[PDB]
Amino acid sequence: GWKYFKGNFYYFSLIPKTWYSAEQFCVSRNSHLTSVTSESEQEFLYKTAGGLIYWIGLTKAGMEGDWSWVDDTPFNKVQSARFWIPGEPNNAGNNEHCGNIKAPSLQAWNDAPCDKTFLFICKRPYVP
Ligand SMILES: OC[C@H]1O[C@@H](O)[C@H](O)[C@@H](O)[C@@H]1O
Ligand SMILES: [Ca+2]
C-alpha cells in the first residue's frame, strides 16, 4: 500500500500508535516517520491524509527544544514557518514534543503529546 512520490515511498498507517511506537514500526520497515521539505511534499501529504490526523517525523531535540526531523533531515525554521497551523507550535500543557499533520492546508502541523495515539506516515527512499 506504499504510495510513490518524487523518489520516496510513503505508508499511511491503518492503525494508530504513539509517536515512538510509530517510528519503531517505520524503522522495522526500513523507513522513518516522514520529513517534509517542500511545499509540494506538504501538499502531497495533507491531500493524501484526507482530513485525518497523522504523526509525522517532527520531534524536539537539544536543550533549546528546537524542532527536528527523526530521519535527520536538518530542520529549516525559516522555510518551515509556513507549514504550521496558526498558533502552533503552542506547546500545550508544556508537554507537546512531537508533531503531526492535522489540517488539510499548507498550514497543517500541530505539536501534540508524544504519548497520544494517531495514525502515522512512514517515508522510505527509493534507490534505483
Ligand atoms: O486537540 C487538543 C489540543 O491539542 C493541542 O496540541 C492543540 O494545540 C490545541 O489547539 C488542541 O485543543
Ligand atoms: Ca499544540
From Swiss-Prot:
Effect of residue 91 to D: Significant reduction in mannose-binding ability
Compartments (UniProt record): Membrane
Mutagenesis or variant effect for residue 103 to P: Significant reduction in mannose-binding ability; significant decrease in thermal stability; increased sensitivity of sugar binding to pH change
Domain of life: Eukaryota
Disulfide bridge map: 26-122, 98-114
Effect of residue 116 to A: Loss of binding to 6'-sulfo-LacNAc and 6-sulfo-GlcNAc
Consequence of changing residue 90 to A: Loss of binding to 6'-sulfo-LacNAc and invertase
Expressed in which tissues: Exclusively expressed by Langerhans cells. Expressed in astrocytoma and malignant ependymoma, but not in normal brain tissues.
Domain (C-type lectin): residue spans on this chain: 5-123
Record remark on domains: The C-type lectin domain mediates dual recognition of both sulfated and mannosylated glycans.
Purpose of the protein: Calcium-dependent lectin displaying mannose-binding specificity. Induces the formation of Birbeck granules (BGs); is a potent regulator of membrane superimposition and zippering. Binds to sulfated as well as mannosylated glycans, keratan sulfate (KS) and beta-glucans. Facilitates uptake of antigens and is involved in the routing and/or processing of antigen for presentation to T cells. Major receptor on primary Langerhans cells for Candida species, Saccharomyces species, and Malassezia furfur. Protects against human immunodeficiency virus-1 (HIV-1) infection.
Subunit structure: Homotrimer.
Disease listed for this protein: Birbeck granule deficiency: A condition characterized by the absence of Birbeck granules in epidermal Langerhans cells. Despite the lack of Birbeck granules, Langerhans cells are present in normal numbers and have normal morphologic characteristics and antigen-presenting capacity.
Official protein name in the record: C-type lectin domain family 4 member K
UniProt organism field: Homo sapiens (Human)
Lineage start: Eukaryota, Metazoa, Chordata, Craniata, Vertebrata
Part of the whole protein covered: 198 to 325 of 328
